[PDB]
Amino acid sequence: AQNPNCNIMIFHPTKEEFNDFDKYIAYMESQGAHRAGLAKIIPPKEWKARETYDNISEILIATPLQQVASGRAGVFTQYHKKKKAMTVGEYRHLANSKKYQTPPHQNFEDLERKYWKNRIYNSPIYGADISGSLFDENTKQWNLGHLGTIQDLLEKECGVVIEGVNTPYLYFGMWKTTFAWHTEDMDLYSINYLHLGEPKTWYVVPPEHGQRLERLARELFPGSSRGCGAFLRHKVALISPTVLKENGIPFNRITQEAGEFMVTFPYGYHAGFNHGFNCAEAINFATPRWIDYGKMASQCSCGEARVTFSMDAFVRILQPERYDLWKRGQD
Ligand SMILES: O=C(O)CNC(=O)C(=O)O
Numbered sequence: 001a002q003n004p005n006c007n008i009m010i011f012h013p014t015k016e017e018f019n020d021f022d023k024y025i026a027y028m029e030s031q032g033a034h035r036a037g038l039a040k041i042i043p044p045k046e047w048k049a050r051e052t053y054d055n056i057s058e059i060l061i062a063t064p065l066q067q068v069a070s071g072r073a074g075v076f077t078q079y080h081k082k083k084k085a086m087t088v089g090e091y092r093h094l095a096n097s098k099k100y101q102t103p104p105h106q107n108f109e110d111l112e113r114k115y116w117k118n119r120i121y122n123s124p125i126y127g128a129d130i131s132g133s134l135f136d137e138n139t140k141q142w143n144l145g146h147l148g149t150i151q152d153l154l155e156k157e158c159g160v161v162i163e164g165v166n167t168p169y170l171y172f173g174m175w176k177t178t179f180a181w182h183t184e185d186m187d188l189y190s191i192n193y194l195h196l197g198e199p200k201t202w203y204v205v206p207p208e209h210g211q212r213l214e215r216l217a218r219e220l221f222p223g224s225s226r227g228c229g230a231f232l233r234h235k236v237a238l239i240s241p242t243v244l245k246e247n248g249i250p251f252n253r254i255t256q257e258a259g260e261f262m263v264t265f266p267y268g269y270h271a272g273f274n275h276g277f278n279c280a281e282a283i284n285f286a287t288p289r290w291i292d293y294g295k296m297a298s299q300c301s302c303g304e305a306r307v308t309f310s311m312d313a314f315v316r317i318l319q320p321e322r323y324d325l326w327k328r329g330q331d
């Protein structure tokens with residue numbers, strides 16, 4: 001078995017190897033990358049996502065989200081308070097303000113310490129989940145707006161044609177902006193490219209150990225657990241590395257820098273935070289190996305998780321028994 005300790009692997013494809021996306025994902029899996037739940041891909045030196053980022057300030061963040069925490073430093077939830085629209089140029093100025101900027105620090109580890117110590121005492125503002133792409137249309141390799149669609153993968157694998165579309169999302173972050181512990185919708189893969197700015201630190205649980213994280217989460221968030229049998233689908237709970245270590249939960253961590261891709265694998269729980277002003281782009285995707293994870297994915301039916309139009313068909317075809325109850329939660 002390749003990568004039996006489930007370490008995060010880092011890949012350096014050549015420009016030749018960067019041509020065929022599906023093939024390279026299958027290669028990474030042949031080396032055991034999926035066992036970690038997360039892999040880093042450093043693009044060939046010849047590759048670029050676009051020529052410059054000089055003209056992005058007029059992108060609109062229609063609903064910036066203020067991430068307000070409740071709990072204790074290592075075990076907290078966050079809720080998202082909607083704020084007034086602002087441009088990316090306005091948001092970048094805000095991120096660089098004295099109130100919101102990254103503090104002085106020695107290195108990523110020092111910054112990570114300061115994050116866990118201090119996050120809950122602040123409410124950073126996240127420009128998340130903005131439909132769109134920063135890849136130049138002429139970028140042919142690993143262009144997240146030109147991937148094969150999950151609907152087409154389900155059709156190729158299973159023969160059933162379904163409605164729905166699959167497009168990327170932009171994320172504009174600042175210091176302390178936070179992504180809560182989650183897997184993807186329908187336990188899909190994700191791919192995330194850090195276009196610009198300051199780093200993003202990731203934490204990940206190997207897929208084979210995801211249920212250990214779920215059991216800890218039920219213990220640590222007991223009211224939430226009673227409310228919903230899949231409450232991590234709400235994407236609100238945070239648990240620190242120290243707490244995970246105290247409770248024996250297997251995990252790994254890595255920092256992504258600008259110019260790097262990360263891939264999350266089916267049922268790889270992940271969480272993290274941004275170091276300062278940045279912009280990332282991410283999208284879900286599928287491979288043949290995903291289908292069995294899709295069929296087994298938990299679902300929130302309490303009404304909180306509320307997701308895209310396109311998840312309907314995935315539930316309806318892969319999980320017909322659950323369909324009725326899950327759709328009640330959607331309506
Ligand atoms: O970058 C973020 O805030 C969150 N991204 C992801 O969870 C992802 O790419 O799967």
Ligand SMILES: [Mg+2]
Nearest residue numbers: 056057058059
């Ligand atoms: Mg612009």
Ligand code: NI
Nearest residue numbers: 183184190264
């Ligand atoms: Ni994710």
Ligand SMILES: [Zn+2]
Nearest residue numbers: 228300302304
């Ligand atoms: Zn729920």
